[PDB]
Design a protein around this nucleic acid. Structure first.
Lengths: 180, 106, 63, 384
RNA sequence: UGGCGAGAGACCGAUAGCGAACAAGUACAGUGAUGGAAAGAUGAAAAGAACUUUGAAAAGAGAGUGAAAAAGUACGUGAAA
RNA sequence: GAGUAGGCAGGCGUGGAGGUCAGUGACGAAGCCUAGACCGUAAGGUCGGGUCGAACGGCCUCUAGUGCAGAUCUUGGUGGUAGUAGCAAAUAUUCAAAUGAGAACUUUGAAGACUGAAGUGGGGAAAGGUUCCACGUCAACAGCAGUUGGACGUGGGUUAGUC
RNA sequence: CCAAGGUGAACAGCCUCUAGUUGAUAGAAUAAUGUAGAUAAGGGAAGUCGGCAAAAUAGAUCCGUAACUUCGGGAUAAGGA
RNA sequence: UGUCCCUAUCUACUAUCUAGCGAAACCACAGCCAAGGGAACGGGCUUGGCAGAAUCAGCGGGGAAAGAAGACCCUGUUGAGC
């Protein structure tokens, strides 16, 4: 349960959303725009990209989509405003933040440590093509799950020694340069 | 920002100059909303159904060249928005809406 | 807020089209609670519903 | 097999690629040959295209059918408000061509040329040339050293000079700064002229005489994509053509099994940095003058500006140049007029032009009258 | 190689074995004759998740049941693309 | 001491079968995963770690529906193209309130329009079969949306001596 | 099957009354190329396999109407007002 | 009479950008050229030229592009209509 994390469950809260009917490719990209942020800067950013002030940079699923100036912020040329995705992850940010408060984590240092979007089973419809053919018309829903942890500095400090092995010639030259 | 009521003239002629005939009156509605925003700094505009009748009376493609209208920036209620003030536009009744400078009604 | 059975019933009761039936926009609670044809008949007497007089077709330019 | 009926190619293969001239300024790529005898003077001169008018003039061309006969010629006017000197660059000749050794500016740069260096100006603290202006704290020590450098070295000297956009009817405020080469005496004389003229204005009456040929350099009008049969103007294919007429049919053969650079293709055209040559100077008018439009054969108190102003541009209150024929670039554009790179002596040069009448009819329509006094006189006196 | 009643197997083990291990000659196609699928497994026992908190809600994070929820009625194991 | 077609020999692996190791195994069988290890020229074998939960193996022999990359193979699943092509014919919508978590699409009001009585009107035939109507409701469907519906859940409804 | 007013020869086209819909994914911007509509100075088939496509002509009243003919026609010939 | 000399301009709906919804064809691996040799016309081989992320709108040179076990021709001790 909850894909590979390197954070402390005593200082974390999570939120899960299974079989959510959103474009997988759009909701993967909103998640990768929001990943490794503070929860406050993240929540604010998702309302800005709903009212078309900043944009979600599309990095992987960025094929033949229109360019935009609101991409320059992220060092891309191509960005978009996935309303549905942004609204679903917002619902899951809020729900995570609520669990993080209910456990008792300072809501100020709370930063999204893990966010993962998997693919749900595809929902089945049939379109009708020229010369009386049938094709598939599939929705690709999403499995969104995110983690928010308290920020802690003072780490590594790591790790190991210089447990050294020498020869008679090495040790003898060390004993010489000391005598000098 | 204050609670004010002014009477503006809008040149709808130059704003609808070179539009598709069957989106002229709908564009006039949208451009008066843009006009109310520009002058009252307000992201909520509330066109009176009387102003709707005034723009639309002469069909989709017969929007009058000029329109004398009144814009009241008002204190907001009704599930408080992010903007604390909204602008309520009404049509002023003048026989010839031309040669009129912007005034204030108190 | 589903007064389509009330538009339909009003039109059929008064004996005109659904195009010539004015339900009161302020009095909506009452015309929602209107279920019977007897209820509609009572609301047309109160003047909550009217006939919304014919669009005139002058034969004056014809004459 | 061959074309079957061979025609010359559509389009010049020299003006490529047909992309958007990176700047919006004109970019003078060649200056004249730099005569070292005659006194120091500007070569080219920055200015703004205002619009086109008609002229009438007598024609001294012995042998021509129209010898001593009135001829109508089209004319385009360039607003040329005095351009402010604000710097001087020294260029050393190297085995990788000319290179900028250093540039020195005057301490006092106008808010005009300061606005150039910012894109969000009115948020800025306007701190440009604060420390450089404070290098004049003592008797310009940093300045005298860098000017001594440009005198000792630097086989070429150019002047940084900016337009006075405040004087034009344009709503920009952000004066176009340009380099313009000095062709004059010894490099020491060039450096001293570029120094002595710091914080001063240079007008057009000094640089450009009358009856002197000019090279108008500017970026052309936009037009966007502007499809196949308008940019090269290839054949329109027959009415019967499926999938479109407005095209080129055969790109190429196989072998070479690639579309070629020579083939005419679609994509944005217009807004290219073009240079036209041999535009004869007709008028170099002044701003210190009403009766700008007045010839020696008219004597009427009117300005070159038509009735209701130059359409899209405005009124011309500054010293200007009206020049024969069309020159490249839109109205409200930044033009650079450069002196002839050679001595054209084809009887179209050497030819003393004398204007008879300048059109000032409202070219915002089919204007009848030259002045409000003529309109009132012919019509009138109703109803104001 | 039918019907009924029984014993069996160096047979098959859910794409195999009968078309059918399941409400199979069922659903469904075609006017009709006829054509004709896919589809088994939570756990010993439902003990099928009380109760708290976010959300309009679905659900989430807890709490709990369980020998395990890395068994949640999308249920043994859970490969590869 | 080469080798296609081809022959022959020696082995490796799989489902079962007889015999044996008084074989291993809920203190964990088999299965699967493993930039860990060892053996074998190789087919393959063995071991450690994880997951898992009920069977399985060595050896001497018997037997075969016994080993896959190809068959425009079969069935099932999955992709890249791709958030691309596109969702552009039937002139056209707009303002307000109400409802609601949510309204371009729902209800009402108000405009502006169209069909223009060889109609986008009002009935019927064949065909369908409850789609009719009410209440409740929106996971699926209505290639946007959805509070709406010919959808979904529960009910109600078709009266003849003359049709 | 029933079938209104006006224009008009008219159940043609165009506009309205009764009655009915306002349903066909929307918002923004107006590059190329398209698709469906249009216009073009002068020339007038030179284009082209070929006048393909479009243009022109058009209702009504009066005038006039040829060769040819199976004596019925051609005929709204043509050409005008 | 824009069929043409010779093209131009305009309107609407597309395209384009956005929110939503969201296919298919095809796909050994793939995608820069020149010559060479070679199943005698290479994306890959040899020798050169060269070569810098991510890409958007167009385009119709190429991919001997896609569609379909050539229907023409021959063979077959394969058939059918006549």
């Amino acid at each position: 349960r909850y894909g590979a994390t390197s954070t402390n469950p005593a200082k974390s809260a999570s939120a899960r959303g299974s079989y959510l009917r959103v474009s997988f490719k759009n909701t993967r990209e909103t998640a990768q725009a929001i990943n490794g942020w503070e929860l406050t800067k993240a929540q604010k950013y998702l309302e800005q990209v709903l009212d078309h002030q900043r944009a979600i940079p599309f990095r992987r699923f960025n094929s033949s989509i229109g360019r935009t100036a609101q991409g320059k912020e992220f060092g891309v040329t191509k960005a978009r405003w996935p309303a549905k995705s942004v609204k679903f992850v917002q619902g899951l940010l809020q729900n995570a933040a609520a669990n993080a408060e209910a456990k008792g984590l300072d809501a100020t240092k709370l930063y999204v440590s893990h966010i993962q979007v998997n693919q749900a089973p595809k929902q089945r419809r049939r379109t009708y093509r020229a010369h009386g053919r049938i094709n598939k018309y599939e929705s690709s829903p999403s499995h969104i799950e995110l983690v928010v942890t308290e920020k802690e500095e003072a780490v590594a400090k790591a790790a190991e020694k210089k447990v050294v092995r020498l020869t008679s010639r090495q040790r003898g030259r060390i004993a010489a340069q000391k005598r000098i | 920002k204050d609670v004010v009521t002014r009477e503006y003239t809008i040149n709808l002629h130059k704003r609808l100059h070179g539009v598709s005939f069957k989106k002229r009156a709908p564009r006039a509605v949208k451009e008066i909303k843009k006009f109310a925003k520009l002058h009252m700094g307000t992201d909520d505009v509330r066109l009176a159904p009387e102003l709707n009748q005034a723009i639309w009376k002469r069909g989709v493609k017969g929007v009058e060249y000029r329109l004398r209208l009144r814009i009241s920036r008002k204190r907001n209620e009704e599930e408080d928005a992010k903007n604390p003030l909204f602008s309520y536009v009404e049509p002023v009744l003048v026989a010839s809406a031309k040669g009129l400078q912007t005034v204030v009604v108190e | 807020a589903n007064l389509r059975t009330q538009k339909r019933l009003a039109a059929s009761v008064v004996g005109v089209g659904k195009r010539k039936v004015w339900l009161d926009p302020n009095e909506t609670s009452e015309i929602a609670q209107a279920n019977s044809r007897n209820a509609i008949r009572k609301l047309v007497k109160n003047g909550t519903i009217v006939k919304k007089a014919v669009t005139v077709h002058s034969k004056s330019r014809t004459r | 097999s061959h074309r079957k009926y061979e025609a010359p190619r559509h389009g010049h293969l020299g003006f490529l690629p047909r992309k958007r001239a990176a700047s919006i300024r004109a970019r003078v790529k060649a200056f004249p040959k730099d005569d070292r005898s005659k006194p120091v003077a500007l070569t080219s001169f920055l200015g703004y295209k205002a619009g086109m008018t008609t002229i009438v003039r007598d024609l001294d061309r012995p042998g021509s059918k129209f010898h001593k006969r009135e001829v109508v010629e089209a004319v385009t006017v360039v607003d040329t408000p005095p351009v402010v000197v604000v710097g001087v660059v020294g260029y050393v000749e190297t085995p990788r061509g000319l290179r900028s050794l250093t540039t020195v500016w005057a301490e006092h740069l106008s808010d005009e040329v300061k606005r150039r260096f910012y894109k969000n100006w009115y948020k800025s603290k306007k701190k440009a040339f604060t420390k450089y202006s404070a290098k004049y704290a003592q008797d310009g020590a940093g300045i005298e050293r860098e000017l001594a450098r440009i005198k000792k070295y630097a086989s070429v000297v150019r002047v940084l000079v900016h337009t006075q956009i405040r004087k034009t009817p344009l709503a920009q405020k952000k004066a176009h700064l340009a380099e313009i080469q000095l062709n004059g005496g010894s490099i020491s004389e060039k450096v001293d002229w570029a120094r002595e003229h710091f914080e001063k204005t240079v007008a057009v009456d000094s640089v450009f005489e009358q009856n002197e040929m000019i090279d108008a350099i500017a970026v052309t009008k936009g037009h966007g994509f502007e499809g196949v049969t308008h940019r090269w103007g290839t054949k329109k294919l027959p009415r019967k053509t499926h999938r479109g007429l407005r095209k080129v049919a055969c790109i190429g053969a196989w072998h070479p099994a690639h579309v070629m650079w020579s083939v005419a293709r679609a994509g944005q055209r217009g807004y290219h940095s073009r240079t036209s040559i041999n535009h004869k100077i007709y008028r170099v008018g002044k701003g210190d003058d009403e009766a700008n439009g007045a010839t020696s054969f008219d004597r009427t108190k009117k300005t070159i500006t038509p009735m209701g102003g130059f359409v899209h541009y405005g009124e011309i209150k500054n010293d200007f140049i009206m020049v024969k024929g069309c020159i490249p670039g839109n109205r409200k554009r930044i033009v650079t007029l450069r002196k002839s790179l050679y001595t054209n002596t084809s009887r179209k040069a050497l030819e003393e032009v004398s204007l008879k009448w300048i059109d000032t009819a409202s070219k915002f329509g089919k204007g009848r009258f030259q002045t409000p006094a003529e309109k009132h006189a012919f019509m009138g006196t109703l109803k104001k």
